[PDB]
Amino acid sequence: EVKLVESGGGLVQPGGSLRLSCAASGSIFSINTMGWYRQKQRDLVADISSGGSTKYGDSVKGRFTISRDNTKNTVYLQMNSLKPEDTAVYYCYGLSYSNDDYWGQGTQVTVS
Amino acid sequence: YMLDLQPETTDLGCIQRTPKIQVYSRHPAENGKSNFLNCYVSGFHPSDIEVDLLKNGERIEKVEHSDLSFSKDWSFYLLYYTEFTPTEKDEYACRVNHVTLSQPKIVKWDRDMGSHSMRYFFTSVSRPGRGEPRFIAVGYVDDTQFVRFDSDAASQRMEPRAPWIEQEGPEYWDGETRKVKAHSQTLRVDLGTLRGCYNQSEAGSHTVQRMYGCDVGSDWRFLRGYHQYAYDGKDYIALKEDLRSWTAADMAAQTTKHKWEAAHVAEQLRAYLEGTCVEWLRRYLENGKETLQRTDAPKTHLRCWALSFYPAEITLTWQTELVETRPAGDGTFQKWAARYTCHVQHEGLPKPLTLR
């Protein structure tokens, strides 16, 4: 039903920064919370509701900032001061207003 | 009333489980009537877990949770809850993340559906580099929690969790706070010790669990005592039913066994379990008689339902899928199971009931 288009990953030097972005397809009425997990288990990085309510994982608090376009269902993740331990596949995800979760394919992020 | 030994007495000398999830309301849901939305996670190990309550695709802001406790098999359980007024359009779910899950799991809320004991539970989880281990202690009388201690909390005091224990004066709370901090110091030292006895890396997180308590009959006389210990969710050393000998699980626990047999630790524990534990349990049963000495019979109604009962021990058999007994959040408990008849055994019932 919903497709999540991700972009912005790749290689970066320690201390550098990257901007991830995730765009949701379909109706703007079909997605509420959008955000990222990173990867056995995958851990919360950041997510944001349609109303702008944010939540961050402890390991990225202060350095990472998530934001949202008011018009489209598109979110951006500004990852500053990157460390080697931030290397992972970052999965975009979204929640419908009926609490159905959608997951993107993920973007590899590697910090030298 | 906790154990009061010196830290050197219990000095040590030398498997992951996924959570079961249940989302439910405290009371039957009525649109426009305030209620409580519950997410009950149980049977998981390690204790690290992330739980969200969701409303219409976003996180509910003010969600509380119970104090961490564990079952006989050492697996943990927690209740996450929030006050809510359900309407026709709103949709609710619980999201759980755990090391055993490749991605967070979402369980949606389906809106259309004697003897006594005192127990103490202690959990210490190491966080290398992030500081001292996370230490949580809880005390129970039957299925009613009455005290707690969290190392991460601000008070650094043993805190009341039942109305009847608030009667106690400063001398009681000073002694309980002093003893629970000594339990914490012992567990922290044991965490560092156990890492050496198993040759483990200093970067990994490990869990130490301690449980003890006593049972009495309906005559309030001593029945059985307990004192058990676990490392990373596996049995380490346990005091046998006779309270005079130890059960060691592996070679490292056998060295502690010999150090504890020589130093006569079991004799100091038996004095507490047969004496002090029993004495203060009877004091608690008396002081909280309106709460603790009550029995609420299950309101009952192929799915056999049983609601709003206390204590939690119950048997539901069909003559099959039975869920784990779950806390309603107000002191009572709930359960259900799935030509045929349903048998219900409970302490609050005159005789077993039958539902057809």
Residue numbers in the entry:
A (entry chain B): 3 to 41, 45 to 117
B (entry chain A): 1 to 14, 25 to 123, 144 to 331, 344 to 361, 371 to 389, 399 to 416
From the paper:
Human MHC class I proteins, or human leukocyte antigens (HLA-I), bind peptides, mostly eight to 14 residues long, for presentation on the cell surface for recognition by cytotoxic immune cells. HLA-I proteins are composed of a polymorphic, integral-membrane heavy- or α-chain (α1, α2 and α3 ectodomains) and an invariant light chain, β2-microglobulin (β2m). In order to coordinate α/β chain co-expression and incorporate specific peptides during secretion from eukaryotic cells, a linked “single-chain trimer” (SCT) construct, coupling all three components into a single polypeptide, has been widely used. Success was ultimately achieved by isolating and recombinantly expressing the VHH domain from a novel, high-affinity, anti-β2m camelid antibody, allowing the crystallization of all SCTs tested.
